[PDB]
Paper text:
The last 16 C-terminal residues of TIPRL show no electron density in the crystal structure, indicating structural disorder. The asymmetric unit of the crystal contained two molecules that seem to form a dimer. The β-strand in the N-terminus of TIPRLΔN (β1) is critical to form the dimer interface in the asymmetric unit and its amino acid residues originate from a plasmid-derived sequence instead of TIPRL itself (GHMAS), agreeing with the fact that the full length TIPRL construct does not dimerize. This positive density can be correctly modeled as the four C-terminal residues from the TEV cleavage site, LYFQ, bound to the TIPRL chain A. The same peptide was bound to the symmetric binding site on chain B and stabilized by further interactions with chain A, which allowed for the modelling of the entire TEV site, ENLYFQ. The binding site for the peptide shows alternating patches of hydrophobic (I147/F150 and L141/L182) and positively charged residues (K171/R173 and R184/R200). One major exception is R200, which engages in ionic interactions with the C-terminal carboxylate group.
TIPRL (TIP41, TOR signaling pathway regulator-like) is a type 2A phosphatase regulatory protein which is still poorly understood both structurally and functionally. In a previous study, we performed a yeast two-hybrid screen using human TIPRL as bait and found that it binds the catalytic subunits of PP2A, PP4 and PP6 and inhibits the activity of PP2A in vitro. The TIPRL interaction surface on PP2Ac includes the active site and overlaps with the binding surfaces for LCMT1, PTPA and PME-1, supporting a role for TIPRL in PP2A biogenesis or recycling.
Author numbering:
A (entry chain C): 11 to 14
B (entry chain A): 11 to 256
Amino acid sequence: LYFQ
Amino acid sequence: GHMASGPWKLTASKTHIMKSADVEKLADELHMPSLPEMMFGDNVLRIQHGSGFGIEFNATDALRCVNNYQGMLKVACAEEWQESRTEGEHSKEVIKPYDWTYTTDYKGTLLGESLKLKVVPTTDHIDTEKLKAREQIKFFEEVLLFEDELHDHGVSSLSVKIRVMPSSFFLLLRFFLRIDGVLIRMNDTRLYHEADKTYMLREYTSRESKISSLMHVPPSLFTEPNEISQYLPIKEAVCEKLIFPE
Ligand SMILES: [Cl-]
Ligand code: NI
């Protein structure tokens, strides 16, 4: 879920 | 739905697509032949400060940024999908044909009755070292704004999502366009804020490439925005600060  | 943390209020609306009667009406307003098949006009992702100022992302304001009908497709096409009342206009910009692709450079809608975020230029970039940093994600939400399948020739979609960390948040508005066998286009709006700061960073990038130049890439990546992005040249890039009002 840690999209960049 | 609703997510609160101090002076910040996050709102996310997810409902059904717009009905035919409201689609034709809105399309006429925006001087467009039609709207995306899946038009989530009641959907929104909204960030609001207690002071009143904030920013939101909705499909309607996004469609306002799209090149509307100019009446050139009568020359370019043997037959059109639908006609449209030609837009009054015009800006000093060069007239370009409507292309049914719903490409939008929308970067969000600024909120506030009186107090409002001020958009100013900046040399800053969103620090990816801070993005890569892994605190616990307190809140995460993803909202679809519109989607169209281009009469079965590909896909055009606009969605927005957000990560909320203990002392920061990161948002990504993404327009993704694939015309099968032709091109891939991606317009990203990234929004970042640290708790202490009195401003947000908003970084916009527009990427695109002909598929013919992507033939060394596994075709499966063409349906995966996150994976194909790195292969697309950047043709436009803007970074701005959104200053908090006094
Ligand atoms: Cl046109
Ligand atoms: Ni914060």
